[PDB]
Amino acid sequence: AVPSVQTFGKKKSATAVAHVKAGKGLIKVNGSPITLVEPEILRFKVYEPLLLVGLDKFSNIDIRVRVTGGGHVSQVYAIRQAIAKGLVAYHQKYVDEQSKNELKKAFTSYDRTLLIADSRRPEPK
């Protein structure tokens, strides 16, 4: 019944599903808040989808992320990818396309690996 949006963030074998919907503004990773995501030195790697665009985008929506697999740093990279492209997809579908591609421009100017992973490797020289 609610406007909701589901995205995916992947690094090596971690995978994070982020559901974004309209709400009061709560960002929850694995049930716990976002301010508990260990190893606590990469908590700003998790935070930078919020601090790159401002918390006034997150003031009206609530995100929840479920992260399985991987290790510590692969899980924080999956979390930040899921949060970033979930915010982009929510502003695409339920807010205007101008804020959509402003968010895409800001995340892509920081690093496009917030939005597109580096996936299939190696190179056979």
Binding site: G23, G25, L26, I27, P33, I34, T35, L55, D56, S59
Partner: peptide, 10 residues
Amino acid sequence: TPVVLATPIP
């Protein structure tokens, strides 16, 4: 509007 979130952020 002063931005406040439900998850408290430091």
